[PDB]
Amino acid sequence: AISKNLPLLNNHFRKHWQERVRVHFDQAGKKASRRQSRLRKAAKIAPRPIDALRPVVRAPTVKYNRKVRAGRGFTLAELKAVGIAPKYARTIGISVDHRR
């Protein structure tokens, strides 16, 4: 059971794991279908862009202070400063975050 100068392993395979094996054979098929869905969605609303405008926010932790990423929605104060109501903002391709 234990015989060599080898590392001691943690292989969690004592359950019926073979009944829950998910092999992603459809990775290429999913890629193609995702592209087709994206194309149809874009064509449905042309020339209006598919992606709403997102804000820029600081990543929260001491580890990711330096990085800055895309947020979820512009705060109500930010939209207030540019004279766009949140209800009207959501209709012209701008995302709103009431929580931030």
């Binding site: 020339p47 209006r48 862009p49 209800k87 209709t91 012209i92």
Partner: protein
Amino acid sequence: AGVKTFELRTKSKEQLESQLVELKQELATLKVQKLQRPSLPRIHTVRKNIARVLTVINLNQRENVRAFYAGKKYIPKDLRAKKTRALRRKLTKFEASQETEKARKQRIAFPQRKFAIKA
């Protein structure tokens, strides 16, 4: 090929039953002859003619019922749609399109705009 359906549909209730009785005695007479022939392919022709006349009688009869119940709130269930049990429980177009007056005021006030970028 036996009787022609389009000729039957021009016949009245009285005439269709008179023809139905004769076709039945035609089949009755042939079943007597089958005991001696014994092969008699004419059996198959008369049976389909009996079926055709029975079909025309029923279809012409069901059309009178459909006309009688046209526009009534409650009509016989056999005259109703037979889509599926689930589709009959589904909300109708009018029911599913109902909105609260609060919801209508906001949808009118803030419609989905049409716009473009880079201009």
